[PDB]
């Protein structure tokens, strides 16, 4: 597996949940910050998101400030999941593309 091109032109994505179905209380509770950061940081937005008066455009890499803004919006009940590009939905043969992988940690 090697990063072999810039963009594969796919339209598929995955949705990263922000809430977890707690079982003891039978309710949806916010996930921990470290768990949210481990699945969102340095990832390319697949669709456009509008939260807290800020427009995040499609094709934007998510910095740690963006991830913290998304968590703030979840606490205010404005967003439940984030659509992002992932290697699971990349269409490059023998590897992945730059937009589906994201940032170099």
């Amino acid at each position: 597996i090697v990063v072999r091109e810039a963009d594969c032109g796919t339209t598929n994505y995955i949705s990263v949940p922000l809430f977890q179905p707690d079982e003891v209380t039978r309710s949806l509770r916010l996930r921990k910050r470290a768990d949210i950061e481990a699945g969102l940081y340095g990832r390319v937005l697949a669709r456009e998101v509008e939260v807290l008066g800020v427009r995040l455009e499609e094709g934007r890499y998510l910095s740690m400030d963006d991830v913290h803004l998304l968590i703030k919006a979840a606490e205010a009940g404005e967003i439940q999941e984030v659509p992002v590009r992932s290697p699971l939905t990349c269409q490059t043969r023998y590897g992945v593309c730059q937009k589906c992988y994201g940032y170099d940690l």
Partner: protein, 105 residues
């Protein structure tokens, strides 16, 4: 990582519907009743149920505590559900030891 079948595997619902408990001293059986179908699941006496009467379960939703068989889940729900399950369950182990690791890897 080897997609092995757990020894003490949980029992999931192959179809969606409303549950129907018939607890008796002879045995315990779980019925999934739907609009045109009705499936029977014979749990052992040592079964820790996580679903009570009058609940709406979907296909692939567990009916007992335990580890889900990935192969059974793939046939019941689809490729996207088993991929989500595998990534989340692997990250649970590394979180318990306080290890930070991105989901991409």
């Amino acid at each position: 990582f080897e997609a092995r079948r757990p020894k003490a595997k949980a029992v999931i619902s192959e179809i969606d519907g409303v549950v129907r408990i018939e607890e008796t001293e002879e045995k315990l059986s779980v019925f999934v009743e739907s609009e045109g179908f009705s499936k029977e699941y014979k749990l052992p006496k040592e079964a820790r149920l996580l679903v009570k009467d009058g609940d709406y379960v979907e296909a692939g939703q567990p009916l007992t505590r335990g580890a889900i068989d990935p192969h059974q889940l793939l046939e019941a729900k689809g490729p996207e559900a088993v991929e989500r399950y595998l990534v989340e369950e692997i990250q649970k182990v590394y979180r318990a030891q306080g290890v930070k690791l991105h989901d991409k890897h």
